[model samples]
Target: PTTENLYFQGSMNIFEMLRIDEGLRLKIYKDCEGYYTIGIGHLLTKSPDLNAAKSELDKAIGRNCNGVITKDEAEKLFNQDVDAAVRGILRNAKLKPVYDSLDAVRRCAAINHVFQMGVTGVAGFTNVLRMLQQKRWDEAAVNLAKSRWYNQCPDRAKRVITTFRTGTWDAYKNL
Candidate 1:
């Protein structure tokens, strides 16, 4: 029962986490640092130096050029972006079933990793995925804990591993 509840609740938590972290904006306006942004804080500026480039700005404001999006449109874009992120993760054949078979917290952790590292980056975790597929949760958690990703962001990594091991929300901390 708890696991099932965690699945639904955790999915929403992930959604909200992304929403809050990114912030929402209906207008095609630049960010605090002046990089163009719109729709749930979608980064119009993909690269740092390119932020001010005219061509890059044009591309960033593609659909929103000289226009503004409604809150509903912003929410729709957020869902679409999240779906694409998850779909990118599922594109990995080796990790597809492994991800599907996981409980809520584990699956949430997997998504967070995929979101952070991207498909290619996470694909490097072959051993970790294998361990997760085998239901060796502790081993999987440990392997992830020892990864460069963990070192890259210790606080975020700790929160994800904690969720994986406990299967509960940790006060809305990083995924």
Candidate 2:
């Protein structure tokens, strides 16, 4: 009903999903595809390289300015990354109101679309996006399973699809 409530509620539904999707890492490292990443999958802005990535987040979190962040800092970066993905998803003008209409659990799955595929990749889901926006939950799950990403990350996709199908957090929270 209000901006504050929406933000608070949305994050609550997503944290476990994110922890499983990205995993929690406090040290700077490269992502699976070699992009520089750190602190629970927060991708850096290019200039940081590796050395810079560590202390930047380290100092900001008051964690000795070392080459690592604390658990609190890791979760902080995780939340920041999730928020960025959320903003990216809303950039789709047609998707915005539909996103707003979803309950918190459904909203997390949509935001996961952005996190996994990027906004441009999400554009290819035009068909599935319609199914989702119409609240045709099961049909949307079927089409989402048909996507290329599903083949690449089958188990994770199944969990997300189940969340969409069920409108509940059990799939993500349980494992």
Candidate 3:
């Protein structure tokens, strides 16, 4: 059942999945893959403003920082729960390539201190998760289709979508 070879022919596949280290492969959407999480193995460093990441992402997308289910709603989503929502999309089990790429994203954001890339990039990556959760296959496909991975950067945005569409993420599994 494993597709050992990935025939993902794209303009930027190289950037999405690159071998930075000898044994440790860096994936831009690495965090989304569940192979490495804050509490899990792949999280390279300590966890940072994940909740803040979500809140800012909501604003970037022009949606309420909170979801449709409100803080004052009859069934309220807790602080940890909201954070969990962000974590859920970014750290889903079904998408390992997404996870690897995000790890790279976080790394770049931290190193660069360029706030916009981290926020918007994460939002774009999260869109795939949101679509998948909603079972909106076509929309998910489109989001993934239009996304771009900065192959040279090692923390490009397209890694997330590529993971969703491709059967085997050639970048992560080999690492």
Candidate 4:
């Protein structure tokens, strides 16, 4: 009798959101913008430019600058990248207003956005941040929806917007 909805479905994690949002790739491949990417959309480009860089797991995986990777290696890399996103978000003064107020699920969504767009990119959404700071979820959603990222990553964008709007993990649960 309604046991389904009562199970809690457990807590949501950034890895689950990223797994769906970023997609997995054991072998490095070109992303939408043609830069080398792998392991749940981790970019291999050097910071100043789009030059290829070695995956930290390459040596441990017995690969010498190879484009291929093992699932375990990818998982490790993804973990590190997610950590980077978390630290990046926490350090951004511009994000403090909403980041501190959001629950885990919505915070994960915001981190996912930072994962793809970088903290600097997300900082540009002053309107979204302001609305979110004021607890105007719908306004924040609409503000984010009007950005170029909405078109660039429609599926991820939709899920993120829904999470922000509903303050629930429902969007990420199915996807």
Find the candidate with the highest TM-score and give its number: 4
lDDT of each candidate versus the true structure: 0.66, 0.72, 0.36, 0.77
Candidate 4 TM-score versus the reference: 0.85
What does candidate 1's lDDT look like per residue over 1-175, in tens digits?
5676657564566667556445677765655545566777565554455434435434544552443666876787667667877898788787788889888766777776676556788877888888887888788778888887677556545666766666666535443
**What are the per-residue Cα lDDT tens digits for candidate 4 across 13-127?**
7888788777899876766656667788787773433333455435435577467787888898889889998899888889866799887778888888898889889998888
Question: In each prediction, how many residue pairs overlap at the backbone (N, C-alpha, C within less than 3 A)?
Answer: 0, 0, 20, 0
| Candidate 3 lowest-lDDT run of ten | 33-42
lDDT string for model 2 (34-99, tens) is 566667667654553666666566655665646566788788777877888888878778668668
lDDT of 2: 0.72
Q: How do all models score by TM-score? A: 0.64, 0.71, 0.26, 0.85
Over 46-101, each residue of candidate 3 has an lDDT whose tens digit, in order, gives 33545544454354335554422232321121223233434444454544343444
Show model 2 residue runs off by greater than 4 Å: 1-12, 29-36, 44-67
Residue 146 miss distance in model 1 (angstroms): 2.0
Q: What count of clashes does model 2 give?
A: 0
Q: Predicted candidate 2: what Cα RMSD to the true structure?
A: 6.3
Off by over 4 Å in 1: 1-11, 19-46, 52-77, 171-175
Off by more than 4 A, model 3: 1-117, 124-127, 135-138, 147-159, 170-175
